[PDB]
């Protein structure tokens, strides 16, 4: 029935005539067309040429209009016809996009079929003000033992993942998508999360490897991926951050929850600098224009925690920023630091010393603080944060230390063994009830006699025990939320029973 569906489309097609407000082309070069005419175009309005490419008019000058091109300029000759559409740029949005691969303009690139979305939304909208917001209180669970213990993330906070090349910045933001599967197949409607992933200027083979990683873990039925790759034109890597917040604001407007990841924002300031200097705008520091702060501020301020009178929705934003030689005092690493709330600083030195994920907790902060942790995690990690911070003071005495006080030998002894609890393999996100049990085994003092090399083998043995043989205790910390006095004694003989006969 292949002939029937092709005959179906062409009778269902609309072949109607209209008017236009055209204007000829003056000088096409390097992706900037100059059009004479078009006397009633608004700023940032989408036009379309005679070949089929589309264009967004950025400069409204007296005798001409500067329009960037969504493609390649070898199809644009001098003396063409630039018709008018009559509308600012708009993307399809809805529930139907869940589990698809889209480019920066909402077309389908995965070849399954066209989007059946019935709604449409602008990309240039504003943030909510001061009144429709409320303070962040619910936890956003990542699944990394070092993030949820020391640098937590609430549901509406902006948290920056900053670090050099090749240190696991993409991998931290790829198991946070995997970890929300345990809520997304259940019943509790106010604990589900939806993830969006924006790739800005990466090669096509890398995105084709990451969709297969999220297809394997059955985590591409609630995730959308917006791909503006390296080969695509310079303005399509500019729209693609603003084409993802418009899909993450449909879930905030309708009482649901969301998550978005910009990978990465340091390749949007470069794809926008090229568009500026070809339109002859006045440069500034490192040849960036005067409004690169206004480019990133009005994208991150769209992440908000709404209140109950508007729906109770949320939007959480995680931008990735690549530094060069660990210098965060550059132009773009200081714009996005002063906008967001806290940073996660992944070093390269700790990655080869064995600490993986290589989160430096000396420089990582979060300014929502402890108000986004559950009551169980808050009780044990408040002492762990104080215990680790006393270790980092005395880390420089470990290389030659045996003639020190027994308190200082103790402070070294707990700091090494708390570090081994923080290491974690890739694509293994845990639960908060299993996370609080492992921290409780360490911060109390139940490990200062076990050898420091065995802390990993002890932990994988202990976790597989309490899943099968103590399942009714990890339902009274998940549902309770806090850890009571009854569960404090019940957990106390558990880690004493396992530690007694362990080495076998």
């Amino acid at each position: 029935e292949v002939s029937s569906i092709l005959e179906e489309r062409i009778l269902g097609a609309d072949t109607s005539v209209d008017l236009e407000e055209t204007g000829r082309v003056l000088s096409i070069g390097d992706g900037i067309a100059r059009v004479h005419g078009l006397r009633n175009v608004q700023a940032e309005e989408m036009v379309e040429f005679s070949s089929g490419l589309k264009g967004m008019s950025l400069n409204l000058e007296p005798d001409n209009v500067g329009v960037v091109v969504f493609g390649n300029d070898k199809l644009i000759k001098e003396g063409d016809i630039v018709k008018r559409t009559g509308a600012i740029v708009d993307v399809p949005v809805g529930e139907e996009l869940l589990g698809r691969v889209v480019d920066a303009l909402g077309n389908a690139i995965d070849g399954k079929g066209p989007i059946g979305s019935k709604t449409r939304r602008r990309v240039g909208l504003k943030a909510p003000g001061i009144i429709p917001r409320i303070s962040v209180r619910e936890p956003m669970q990542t699944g990394i033992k070092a993030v949820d213990s020391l640098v937590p993330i609430g549901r509406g906070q902006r948290e920056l993942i900053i670090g050099d090349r090749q240190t696991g910045k993409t991998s931290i933001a790829i198991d946070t998508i995997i970890n929300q599967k345990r809520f997304n197949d259940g019943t509790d409607e106010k604990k589900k999360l939806y993830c969006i992933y924006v790739a800005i200027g990466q090669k096509r083979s890398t995105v084709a490897q990451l969709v297969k990683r999220l297809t394997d873990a059955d985590a591409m039925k609630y995730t959308i991926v917006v791909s503006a790759t390296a080969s695509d034109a310079a303005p399509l890597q500019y729209l693609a951050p603003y084409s993802g917040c418009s899909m993450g604001e449909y879930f905030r407007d309708n009482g649901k929850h969301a998550l978005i990841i910009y990978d990465d924002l340091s390749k949007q300031a470069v794809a926008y600098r090229q568009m500026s200097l070809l339109l002859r705008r006045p440069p500034g520091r490192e040849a960036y224009p005067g409004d690169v702060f206004y480019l990133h501020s009005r994208l991150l301020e769209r992440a908000a925690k709404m209140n109950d009178a508007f729906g109770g929705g949320s939007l959480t934003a995680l931008p990735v920023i690549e530094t060069q030689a660990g210098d965060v005092s550059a132009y773009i690493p200081t714009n996005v630091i002063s906008i967001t709330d806290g940073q996660i600083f992944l070093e390269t030195e700790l990655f080869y010393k064995g600490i993986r994920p290589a989160i430096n907790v000396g420089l990582s902060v979060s300014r929502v603080g402890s108000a986004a942790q559950t009551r169980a995690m808050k009780q044990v990690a408040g002492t762990m944060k104080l215990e680790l911070a006393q270790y980092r003071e005395v880390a420089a005495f470990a290389q030659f230390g045996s003639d020190l006080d027994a308190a200082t030998q103790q402070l070294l002894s707990r700091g090494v063994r708390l570090t081994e609890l923080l290491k974690q393999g890739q694509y293994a996100p845990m639960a908060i009830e299993e996370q609080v049990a492992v921290i409780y085994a360490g911060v109390r003092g139940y490990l200062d006699k076990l050898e420091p090399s065995k802390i990993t083998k002890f932990e994988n043995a202990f976790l597989s025990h309490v899943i099968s043989q103590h399942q009714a205790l990890l339902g009274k910390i998940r549902a309770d939320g806090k850890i009571s006095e009854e569960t404090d004694a019940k957990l106390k003989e558990i880690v004493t029973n396992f530690l007694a006969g362990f080495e076998a």
């Binding site: 096509r204 083979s205 080969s231 090229q274 070809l278 030689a325």
Partner: protein, 234 residues
């Protein structure tokens, strides 16, 4: 294509800490005078004679002497044959005596012959490119006369777009597979220069050479704490 393999070479630093892959893009970093041309001469010695299909060498902006020590080290090894129709290597050469409009269209001419074998035929192709920093630099010379404001330290404003327009044709598709080794000059030992620090997004295995190892006598000077791969995976 999505499948990954491992292509064995025989070098101890490369196969241990940063393994190469069939149909994957490989990069050879490092400064001037550390061994990028010799290490790319080694992989024609090991890999290209044991390989079934053909091979293409594009030389972009390097010394015209060293295009004669390749034409005379490939006749005496029988890879180029001057008497019949059993040769296995093509060669495309635009060297550093050419005008700067001709050092920026030679690398597009290398991967046009190497696109014929992958697409119109089905064989497994290799591709060796040395150097590829002279594709970026030769476009930063014709730029200011075409009427463009310079960006950061002196490159063109369209730097990361025409680089990403060439580096998206060197891929493994569902019609063939192109292994590709590339030498990348790093200017005056600074990997934060805008020409080498944007090629990192297009490479699977990076082999960063270093002058601080080569001045010990350790040869090949490959940095172990700076070389990665995408298949270092248990």
């Amino acid at each position: 294509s999505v499948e990954q393999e491992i292509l064995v070479t025989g070098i101890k630093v490369v196969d241990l800490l940063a393994p190469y892959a069939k149909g994957g893009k490989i990069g050879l970093f490092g400064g001037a005078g550390v061994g990028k041309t010799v290490l790319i001469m080694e992989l024609i010695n090991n890999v290209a004679k044991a390989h079934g299909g053909y091979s293409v060498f594009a030389g972009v902006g390097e010394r015209t002497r060293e295009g004669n020590d390749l034409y005379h080290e490939m006749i005496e090894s029988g890879v180029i044959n001057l008497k019949d129709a059993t040769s296995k290597v093509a060669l495309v050469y635009g060297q550093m005596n050419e005008p700067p409009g001709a050092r920026a269209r030679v690398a597009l001419t290398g991967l046009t012959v190497a696109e014929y074998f992958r697409d119109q035929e089905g064989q497994d192709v290799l591709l060796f490119i040395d150097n590829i920093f002279r594709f970026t630099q030769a476009g930063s010379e014709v730029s200011a006369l075409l009427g463009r404001i310079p960006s950061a330290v002196g490159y063109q404003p369209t730097l990361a777009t025409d680089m990403g327009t060439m580096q998206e044709r060197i891929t493994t598709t569902k019609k063939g597979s192109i292994t590709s080794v590339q030498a990348i000059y790093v200017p005056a030992d600074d990997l934060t220069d805008p020409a080498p620090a944007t090629t990192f997004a297009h490479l699977d295995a990076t082999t960063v050479l270093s002058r601080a190892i080569a001045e010990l006598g350790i040869y090949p000077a490959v940095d172990p704490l700076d070389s990665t791969s995408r298949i270092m995976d248990p």
